[PDB]
Amino acid sequence: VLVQDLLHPTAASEARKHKLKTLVQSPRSHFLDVKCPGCLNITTVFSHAQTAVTCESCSTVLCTPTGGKAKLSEGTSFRRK
Partner 1 sequence: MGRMHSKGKGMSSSAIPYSRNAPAWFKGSSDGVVEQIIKYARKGLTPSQIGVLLRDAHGVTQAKVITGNKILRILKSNGLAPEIPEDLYFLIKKAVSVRKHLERNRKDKDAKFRLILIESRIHRLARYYRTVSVLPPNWKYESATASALVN
Partner 2 sequence: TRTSVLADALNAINNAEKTGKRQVLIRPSSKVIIKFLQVMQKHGYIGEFEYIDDHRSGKIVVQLNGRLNKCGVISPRFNVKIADVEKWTANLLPARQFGYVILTTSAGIMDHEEAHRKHVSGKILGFVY
Partner 3 sequence: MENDKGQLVELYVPRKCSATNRIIKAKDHSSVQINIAQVDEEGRAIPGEYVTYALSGYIRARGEADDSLNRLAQQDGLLKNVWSYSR
Q: How far is the CB of 60 from partner 1 (least distance, A)?
A: 13
Starting from the edge strand earliest in sequence, which strands make up the sheet with 31-35, in order?
A: 42-46, 31-35, 77-80
If binding is defined by CB under 8 A, does position 66 make contact with partner 1? no
Interface with RNA (CB under 7 A), residue total 13
If binding is defined by CB under 8 A, does position 59 make contact with partner 3? no
What's the one-letter identity of residue 21?
K
Cα 78 to Cα 1, 6, 13, 33, 53, distances in angstroms: 43, 36, 28, 5, 14
Binding-site string for partner 3 from residue 6 to residue 25, where x marks contact by CB under 8 A and - marks none: --xxx--x------------
Single out the residue of 10, 25, 40, 59 in contact with partner 2 (rule: CB under 8 A): 25
